[PDB]
């Protein structure tokens, strides 16, 4: 009673209706910070092994930080309209670039290691100091690495400082990997326990409060991190979270399948298709509409997509799933006069648009060909199937948890007749494919009236 | 013995990322294809509750076997890494609660070169929404 | 991995009669359910099949309609119904799981309980 | 309805010794064939499925062969407990399944 899926023959397309919206849109910045070592040049008269060592993981660091110092920044689905991703990442940067703000927020992060502070720009951000380079650099080797007495024959100090380094070390490998921004942010960016105290400190509700806090996996790919500063002793970068704004709302995905109509002759045919696969999510009563699936990504039954590859549809275009023809949304679809084979992959199975002669069939591990179909849409579940081979390729089936159905239906394509369609048509639509057919008709009826 | 609890505390970070990351022109008209299908269906077969315990006691001897899982399809595993061994009868015998005896230094070193493949298994985990391709050498040598 | 039986008992022919399967330590969700009978003394042959979600059932042609299968999710139990009893069906009963996951298409039985013995007769 | 016989009704033999059963389908199966055991007084005991795939947990001496409409098992070295009745069933591609009219195994003195 959670998930499931319907296909509809009436123009061949399958809906899969169980997953949960979850929805960015809002974002949210977080200022991290790591408080750094402006080291004075070591210097030892006299080269210990252990010495050297220590010697080349201070020269790692330094090699890391100067690094960061010369990179301080010193088919439908066509017109949604691009989107600046790291605007306020960047921006928060620019804020703390203001002279001032350093040493505000270093004073504010003298004791503890997470606080909410106001940048200089009004809007509040929360930033931590998760490693500490100052105490381990100062307290830990200068009076241990005096210009002579450089007895540092305890071996193990060079491996603590080795593991209190690899993080801010991966930290600039990733500013030098990325152009300094990245997605997604690995975790020495941010601990994975840092991580759910962010989503637990931070100002959204108690149920987003958990759903945030448990589902870290999504997250990072939903999540960017640029540069900010090195200003003064620490290194301060930023990280962009999402904040959903919409939960709890049940929504669907779309997939597509031709439409054609069966005749012997390989040529000549003629062939419909849904232009609108992708994801509708409901947030505010009207649909939004994800074009192309590289923006959406799935979890069990949570469905977490970014809404900047989103448009907002009118509710009635839900209505396009039972009636492509009805007046009150123009349905989008696509035509076109090659006859070929393939199929699409729902969400419990799969539909074979198996056109021309292609040997398509149906079939379980096991068993073999179990099923051999015909010439047109057809559709198959992944109930007691999982592997649909039609030409040369083997598609296997997603063998999720859910009620198939299949509703019969005689597809809008007969109702097309040939002689007079327009072979070229990727942006049309059911309105616009009937208003061309009306000129055509308009135009062979009155060269023929006037005779 | 800061040293090994940190060691350790890392592998703990490690299987809790794993823990909570638990996942259940022409051209044009190609029609797409679920890529991760198999996989996730054979782990899904693994989900069910009796085949972990068979395929572990398959797996007791030797580090590869082939195996029929519940669902039919006959598979091939491998247990490439073994950290029940080194965490059981080489740290817990050494590290007593008192006498936390560990001067030896390479126990870390070793311990070390056993768990940072597991741990980039973890890492690539969370940094590929538990989906990764290529695979690096630390899933499979 | 265990399988057990209750209910099973004498009644007259023409009366109605349930056999409870409870299933433990196994995938009860994902399998189809098979039931099958032998005479004492006798060799098998097929009962029923439910499928793993109870939508899609299967008997044998000699007993089609007299049976009733049903399974419950919640209580982890499947149940057989039987419905106007003959003399000829007297026999020991075994509830099983199937030799694969969650298939439509059934195959053998690979995990049996002890049995219930049911007998009818005047 | 798939009809399924088996050959020998009865058959013993000693122990150590060879035994061959046989299973004869009405119409064509190309594999679906499984081989059962059942113990005297206990639950029937799956030897093998697929007619030539073991089922794990039983030991080697069992092995099952044919296609087509006629399927063999054959045993190399019997044992004492291998005696009680040797059944084959079918799962050609659909339901009604059907079992076997059987081969009991006991031995001589």
């Known amino acids: 009673q959670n998930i499931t899926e319907e296909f509809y023959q009436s123009t061949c397309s399958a809906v899969s209706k169980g997953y949960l919206s979850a929805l960015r849109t809002g974002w949210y910045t977080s200022v991290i910070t790591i408080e750094l070592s402006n080291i004075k040049e070591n210097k030892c008269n006299g080269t210990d092994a252990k010495v050297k060592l220590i010697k080349q993981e201070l020269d790692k660091y330094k090699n890391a930080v100067t690094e960061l110092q010369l990179l301080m920044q010193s088919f439908l689905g066509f017109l949604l309209g691009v989107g600046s991703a790291i605007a306020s990442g960047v921006a928060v940067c620019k804020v703390l670039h203001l002279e001032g703000e350093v040493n505000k927020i270093k004073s504010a992060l003298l004791s503890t290691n997470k606080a909410v502070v106001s940048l200089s720009n009004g809007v509040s951000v929360l930033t931590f100091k998760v490693l500490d380079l100052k105490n381990y650099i100062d307290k830990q080797l200068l009076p241990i690495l005096n210009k002579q007495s450089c007895s540092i024959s305890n071996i193990e100090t060079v491996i603590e400082f080795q593991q209190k380094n690899n993080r801010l070390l991966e930290i600039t490998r990733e500013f030098s990997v990325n152009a300094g921004v990245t997605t997604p942010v690995s975790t020495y960016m941010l601990t994975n326990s840092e991580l759910l105290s962010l989503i637990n400190d931070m100002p959204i509700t108690n149920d987003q409060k958990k759903l945030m806090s448990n589902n870290v996996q999504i997250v990072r790919q939903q999540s960017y991190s640029i540069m900010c500063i090195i200003k003064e002793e620490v290194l301060a970068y930023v990280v962009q979270l999402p904040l959903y704004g919409v939960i709890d709302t049940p929504c669907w995905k779309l997939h597509t399948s031709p439409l054609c109509t069966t005749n012997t002759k390989e040529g000549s045919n003629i062939c419909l298709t849904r232009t609108d696969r992708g994801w509708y999510c409901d947030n505010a009563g009207s649909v939004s509409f994800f074009p192309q699936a590289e923006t959406c990504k799935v979890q069990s039954n949570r469905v977490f997509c970014d809404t900047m590859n989103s448009l907002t549809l009118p509710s009635e275009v839900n209505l396009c799933n039972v009636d492509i023809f009805n007046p009150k949304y123009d349905c989008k679809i696509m035509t076109s006069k090659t006859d070929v084979s393939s199929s699409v992959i729902t969400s419990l199975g799969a539909i074979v648009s198996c056109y021309g002669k292609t040997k398509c069939t149906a079939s379980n591990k096991n068993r073999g060909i179990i099923k051999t179909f015909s010439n047109g849409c057809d559709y198959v579940s992944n109930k007691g199937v999982d592997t649909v081979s039609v030409g040369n390729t083997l598609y296997y089936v997603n063998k999720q948890e859910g009620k198939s159905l299949y509703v019969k239906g005689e597809p809008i394509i007969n109702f097309y007749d040939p002689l007079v369609f327009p072979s070229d048509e990727f942006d049309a639509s059911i309105s616009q494919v009937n208003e061309k057919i009306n000129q055509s008709l308009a135009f062979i009826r009155k060269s023929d009236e006037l005779l | 013995v800061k040293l090994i609890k940190q060691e350790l505390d890392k592998y703990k970070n490690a299987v809790t990322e794993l823990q909570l990351l638990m996942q259940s022109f022409l051209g044009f008209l190609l029609g797409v294809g679920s890529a991760i299908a198999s996989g996730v269906a054979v782990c899904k077969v693994l989900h069910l509750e009796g085949e972990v315990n068979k395929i572990k006691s398959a797996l007791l001897s030797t580090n590869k076997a082939v195996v029929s899982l519940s669902n039919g399809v006959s598979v091939l595993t491998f247990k490439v890494l073994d950290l029940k061994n080194y965490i059981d009868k080489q740290l817990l015998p050494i590290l007593n609660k008192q006498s936390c005896s560990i001067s030896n230094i390479e126990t870390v070193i070793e311990f070390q070169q056993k768990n940072n493949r597991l741990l980039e298994i973890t890492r690539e985990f969370s940094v590929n929404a538990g989906v990764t391709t290529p695979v690096s050498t630390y899933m499979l040598t | 991995v265990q399988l057990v039986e209750s209910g099973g008992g004498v009644v007259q022919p023409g009366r109605s009669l349930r056999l409870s399967c409870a299933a433990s330590?196994?995938?009860?969700?994902?399998?189809?359910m098979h039931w099958v009978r032998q005479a004492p003394g006798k060799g098998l042959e097929w009962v029923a099949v439910?499928?793993?979600?109870?939508?899609?059932?299967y008997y044998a042609d000699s007993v089609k309609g007299r049976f009733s299968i049903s399974r419950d999710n919640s209580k982890n139990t499947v149940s057989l119904q039987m419905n106007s009893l003959r003399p000829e069906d007297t026999a020991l009963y075994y509830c099983?799981?199937?030799?694969?996951?969650?298939?439509?298409?059934?195959?053998?039985?690979?995990?049996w309980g002890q049995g219930a013995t049911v007998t009818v007769s005047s | 309805d798939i009809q399924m016989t088996q050959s020998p009704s009865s058959l013993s033999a000693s122990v150590g010794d060879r035994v061959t059963i046989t299973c004869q389908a009405s119409?064509?199966?190309?594999?679906?064939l499984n081989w059962y055991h059942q113990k005297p007084g206990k639950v029937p005991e799956l030897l093998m499925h697929?007619?030539?795939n073991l089922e794990t947990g039983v030991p080697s001496r069992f092995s099952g062969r044919g296609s087509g409409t006629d399927f063999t098992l054959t045993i190399s070295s019997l044992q004492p407990e291998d005696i009680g009745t040797y059944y084959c069933?079918?799962?050609?591609?659909?339901?009604?399944?059907?079992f076997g009219g059987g081969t009991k195994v006991e031995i001589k003195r």
């Open positions: 119409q064509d199966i190309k594999k679906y």
């Open positions: 330590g196994f995938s009860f969700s994902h399998y189809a």
């Open positions: 697929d007619a030539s």
């Open positions: 099983a799981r199937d030799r694969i996951v969650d298939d439509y298409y059934y195959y053998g039985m690979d995990v």
């Open positions: 069933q079918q799962y050609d591609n659909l339901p009604p399944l059907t």
């Open positions: 439910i499928s793993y979600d109870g939508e899609n059932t």
